Structure formats: structure tokens, C-alpha cells
Amino acid sequence: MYYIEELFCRLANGVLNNTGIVTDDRGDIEDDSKPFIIVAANEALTRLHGRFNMRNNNVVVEMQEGRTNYPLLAKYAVQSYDPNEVKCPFIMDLAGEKFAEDVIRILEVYDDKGRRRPLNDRNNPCSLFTPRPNVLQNNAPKAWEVLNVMYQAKHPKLSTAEDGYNEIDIPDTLDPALDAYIAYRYYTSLNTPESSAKAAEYLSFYDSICREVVEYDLTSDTEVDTNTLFRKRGWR
Amino acid sequence: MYYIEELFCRLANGVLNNTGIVTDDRGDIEDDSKPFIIVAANEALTRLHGRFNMRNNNVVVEMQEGRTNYPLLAKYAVQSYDPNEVKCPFIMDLAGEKFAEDVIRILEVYDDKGRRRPLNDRNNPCSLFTPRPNVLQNNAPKAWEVLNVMYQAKHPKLSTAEDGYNEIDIPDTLDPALDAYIAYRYYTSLNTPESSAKAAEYLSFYDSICREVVEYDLTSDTEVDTNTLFRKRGWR
Amino acid sequence: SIEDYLKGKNCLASPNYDPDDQHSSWREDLPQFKKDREHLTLVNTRRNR
Amino acid sequence: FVLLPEDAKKIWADVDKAWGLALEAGIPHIYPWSYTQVMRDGVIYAVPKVC
Amino acid sequence: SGHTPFNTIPNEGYCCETLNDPIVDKMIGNAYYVVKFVALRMPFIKNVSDNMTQLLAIHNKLTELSAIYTKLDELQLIHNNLDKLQEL
Amino acid sequence: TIPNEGYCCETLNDPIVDKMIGNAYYVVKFVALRMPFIKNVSDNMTQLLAIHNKLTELSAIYTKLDELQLIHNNLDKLQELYNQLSKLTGL
Amino acid sequence: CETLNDPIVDKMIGNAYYVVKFVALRMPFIKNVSDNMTQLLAIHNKLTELSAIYTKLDELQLIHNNLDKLQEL
Amino acid sequence: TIPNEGYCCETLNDPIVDKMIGNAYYVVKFVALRMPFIKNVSDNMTQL
């Protein structure tokens, strides 16, 4: 829940202390070396959010008469659409946030009437398909039809361009994993044998921390639920 | 329970004697290298409190009419909220206890009437969900409804800025683990072949001490309770 | 401080209370006002200044 | 009183204890005995280390 | 482990007790002593509050009462003899 | 039939709610919100005790304010160089 | 099993909660008193004068209008 | 009404409580708190 400047300071004080990237007073990263750190941080956040299933997000898609493929992009969102290019958007962002393009995997799709819609089921005619990992199909659009999509989400892009996201939202147990990944990227990029050995060390540290977090289940990844098939099958 | 200055003088008179950080009298760390030690100490405390399950804390959250998502952040605490940004806070604090974000895992949630609320149960309509590790969901808020959250907590943030927490609360069997972790970080950051060899030793020492403490169960981590399923199942 | 225990009221009910510092039984805090005397020590003369 | 400077440490520790007792009693004014001995033995006053 | 303060009525095994102290400790911590101090001497507060109307009226005349008090010794002035003389 | 009952609407000056007496949390927060009044009472307890002690005397005075109002107005004329009263009795 | 022991001192709901409820049910008195600290401080200030007047309350009335008329008479 | 019995309110000048005589800890602490009186008596035994 801290800004990008705190990340730059924490890198200036932790790993990357001897490196020539850091300013003279050891306060913050030098200006010309910031895009490198931003790219590395984005890659690390995507890796972690793919691994751990932290964020569960929702989006609402409204159905037009002649369209069957509904890609989930920011072009068709209310808060971000360009009136000249797209006449009518089908992704609603009225309340809050801007729906950054962060669709990794689609889990559940529910109709506007409270009825579930099967995904990727060939033998069920009333099913929804995904030709691409974020594109969604419905082959029979109807009037007054709306679908709610529950999907696994990744961290929104960090840009530091006066309009991008400054905030970093990550569990406090996984800061060292992110820092280790950034250090691995840098020391691999240096292209020397000693730096290569240091990069190997940092990558191994990243893996070990992730495996520890998996062992102790600090993100509450495991889920169970009450049995419902006992009654469906007819047992007494 | 001891000050931060005791930690600085223990690191000045224990490990890190032979390094150039310490002052001439070897009684304290120089002003230039205190942020580094603070960052390392916070990382070590997060590691230990994630591993061992020492602290168990509590929050009181009351439910508003139109809210279902209740992030556990200081922006919504009574002592720390901004009146113009947030109309009404929902997390109750005290002037002495201001609720720093220290939520690792949520264990139990209890109603204001003394009845337990199932957590993350898909097949139970009257259950609470956590989309994110620090966010709660209640799909049917009601009048005069308040919830108690029983969660595992981490150590408060050390800042040494006349407003941060100076003290350290840790069992006396795990001081060498913290010192070894700090030394590991410092010796890795040097980027020389000998320093890495020393850092491997320090990290292995930290691991061995943690494993020993688990082996003898000095923190009373193991918990056992009386059997109540004997009566529920109908046995005689 | 056993003598202080003997010659004391030691009654919990008191009229003094600071609203700025209200806490439960959970909170433990060391005071910021450290109390420490100054002792005589000979200068090292090995640590050249 | 510190004569024969090879005996400085023990006598100055005793001076510390005596000053502690005098401060406990409440005497207003306290003197180290001499300028010569103080400058010869390099006596300085500092808070003790916490460890 | 720990006991949730809102976990009142845990009395599954045996009926007695409800365990309501932890909520008091959680919300009114460090300030229970002032509450008890007021509670012990509450009859005095009740008696004082019962006579609020009057105790405000004695106030609406405090300066006048002080001015009258300044002459209390002089007020008596042995009126009997002067009354007898005036009756003539 | 819009509901307005909630913890947000309540302020420190509101009275108690009879239906929520059974709820322990409601009573605890009821006492917690109104700590300024209890602190004001506690700080000035000696004055209240003295007034309670003298209430038996200050209880009567109250019946006699009306007479004292006229007596206070008369006092200025009533001074009359009190030493002259002995001479007037003599004459 | 049961740790209540003496019923006269120990309450089932809880000692602290019992005191808190006792204070809560009698809040109007505390509120009425607290609203008027400024007024009851003046009476405490002038308590000595009020006590002095109380001593002469029984006398010194004398239907004093009768006395002033007698002076006029 | 409001109970005000406890070990904190107890002082060395208070009399014994007949209810807690059976409690061994109460008797032991009652004797322990009032040790100055016993020491004063023992010091001046010849005079007595």
C-alpha cells in the first residue's frame, strides 16, 4: 500500500547498495535507471500474481445485438473509451476504479438472472467459449442480457508518468521475493561471471521464499467447502 | 522487551565488530548506515512472525448500509482517517492503539451476538469471503451489526523517528536468528567472494536455530483441544 | 520498592486519566524519557582521535 | 585521591560509587579533588553502554 | 492462541458465565477506573442532580447574596428600642 | 419505512435505546462515547461533595429569595449611619 | 466447573461489565450534573458566605418591611 | 451494590476478614504484610 518512491528507497538501502545505479547520498535510484527497475518490478508482480492467486476481481459485460466476440480490453470501458472510435462501450466502470487490463484467467460467469453459464463445454449448447485467453464468446446475444465475469487478476501496470499507478499492493511477506527478482534481473544484465553467480543466488532465494510461503499457507490459498453431492446423488 | 538502541549496540558488539559500519568506540552504528539496519530488521521480523505464529491480535469492524468490501487499512480507522476523503470510518481504535496494518492471516470472525461466522465457504449462503488477504466481504449487511476479526499479526514497524515504535517484542530464544539474518543481508550486499561465503554461514545458522526452536517447541506452537465430535456424531 | 508497597494507598480507582493515551491491556510501551546517570570513565588513549 | 597513577582505575571506580551515594543523599555542590590528577588520568563523564 | 472478545456465551460444556469482561477491556481499557470512581460515589451525584433547579436559582442571585452578607452584623441593629421609641 | 437506525447516526448527545440494552457491545460503546461527562464529574468531585454536604443548608435559603430581593434594594437606604440609631433610641 | 464462588461479590455477567451497565443505566444524572460545572463552581466559591447567611436566616427577616415602615412611621 | 473488595484495597491497618480464614494464601499474605509490627515487638522483647 506504499508508493513507488518507497520501493526506490527500499532498493537503494537494501540490495543494489554497492551498484553505481544508486545516487551519491544513497537516497534513491538515479533518474536514467528508473525504467529498468519499473520493467523488472512489473515482471516480478506478474510472476507472483500468476503463482499465488491473490486477487479476485469482477467485471460486468453488456451484450450488443451484432457482436459475438467480447474482448476484455480498456478500449470498451466507460471510463476509458474514445467516443470517436467506439460508439458504445460494453464494460461498465461507473462506481470506481478504471478496469486496468488485468485478466489472467476466467473462473465463473453468471447471468443477470442469477443463473450460472458453463464455460468451454462443447457438449452443452448454452455454454460460453474463449477463443483467446481474454476474449469471450456468446453465440446467441439477446436483448436485455448482461453477464458478470469472475476472473483472476494481476497487478495493474506501474508507469510513473503522472497518469499511471504509483501504488504497489502486495502482501508484506512477499516484498523480499520482489526485491530478489529485481536484483536477479540487474545482476544477470551486468554480463560478468561474478554477477552471474550473484544472480543465481538471488533467483534461488526468490524460489525458496515462495516455497516457504506456500508451505505455511500465509495467503490462505487452500479452500474447502461443505459437501453438496451427498444430497444430489440420493443418499439418506 | 528492549529499545532499538540496545539492538544497535548488540550488533555493534556482537557480529559486525570487524566491519566499517561501527563507530570508533564500537558502541553504536553510524548515522549513515541506520536505514539499512532498520530495513533488514523489519524484513527479519516479518520472516519470523510469518513462520512461528507468535502474536494473535484483534480488530472490531462495524458494518455500514451500502458497503460489502471492508479493506483493513488505516485510511478507515477513526484515529487515522481524513474527514474529507472518508465520510465515516468503520474500524474502531484507541488513542494509544492506532492499528498499524499488521494482518498476515485471518483465523476467526465472530458476530456481535456471540455466534461464529463461516469464512471462505462457497456452499454456505451465510458466510464471509476474503477477495484479498486484507479485505473482507459481507454480502448482506444489517442494522446494528458488528464483527470481530481474530487474525495472526506481525511486529509493528520500527522507524526511530520519535513517532515510530522503538521497542522490540521477541522471545529471547530468537535474538540470534534476527542477528544472523541481518548479518546475512549485510554480507551479501558487499559483492565479494569472501563475503558471500560468510553470508552462507550466517543464513545456515539462522535456519538451524529456527529448526531447533521448532524441535523443542519453545514457543508452545503446538495446540491440542478436547474432543467434542464424540457427542455430535451420536456415540454413547 | 517493597517499602513503597507498604506505605501506599494502592487503590485502583483513581481520578487521574490521560485521554490522549488510552490503551487496552494489550499495549506495552517503553517510555521515551530514559533515565540514566553519568559515570566517570578514563579516556581510552588507544582509540586515537 | 589518586596518587601513584598506576592505581587510577580502582580509585576512580570508588570515586564513582562515592559520587553516587553523595547524589543520593542530595548534596548541592560536589568537587573532584584536583586539576592535576584529573588532567593526568584523563577522566571524562559519559553514560554507560547498554549491553 | 487467543480468545476472541466477541466470543461471549461459549458456555457449551456448562451453562454458567458469559465472559463479558474482554469487550470492556477492549473498548474502555485504561478508563475503567474513572468509571468505577464515579460509580462508587453515585448517590451524591443523584442527590446533587435532583436539586438542580434550586441550585441554579441560588446562583442567579450570588452577587446580591454577597452584598447582603457584607452587612449581616449591621442588619440586626437592635430594632426593638427604636421601634418602641417610634411608636410614641 | 426507510430505516434510520445505525451506529453512524448516533452522537454523544443522544439518549439510550431501550431495545439494545441486552446487547453488551451497545452498552459498552454507549459508556465509551460519553467519557467527557464522566471525566468532568470526576475532576470536580470535591466541589460536588462540599455542595452535597451543604445542600441541607442551601435547601432552605431557596424559599427566601423573594424577600431578599426587596431587602437588598432597601439596604442602600437602610444604612442610615447605623451609629445614629443609638441616638435615635436615646431621643 | 463453577468459579463464581461467593454470589455477593461475584457477578455472572462480569464485574467490570456490571459496573459499566450500572453507570450506563444512570447516565442522565451525570449528564445534567456535567452540563453545569460552571454554575456549581460559583456556589462552591461562595459556600462560606451562604453558610454565614444561613445562620442569620432564622433572625434578620422580622418582616423587615415592618421595620422600614416603622422608621418611616 | 458495587463491590469494592480486593487485595489492592487492603491495607496493613485493616482488620482480618472472617470469610477468607480458610484460604491459606490469604492468611499467609496477611501475616506477611504486617511484618513491621512483629519486627518491632521482637526487637524490644527485653523491655516488654
UniProtKB/Swiss-Prot annotation, chain C:
Miscellaneous: It is uncommon for short-tailed phages to have a tail tube inside a non-contractile sheath.
Disulfide bonds: none
Subunit annotation: Interacts with host NfrA receptor; this interaction is essential for viral adsorption to the host.
Signal peptide positions (record): none
Function: Assembles to form the non-contractile sheath that surrounds the tail tube. Allows viral attachment to the host by binding the bacterial outer membrane protein NfrA.
Gene: 65
Subcellular location: Virion
UniProt name for this protein: Non-contractile tail sheath
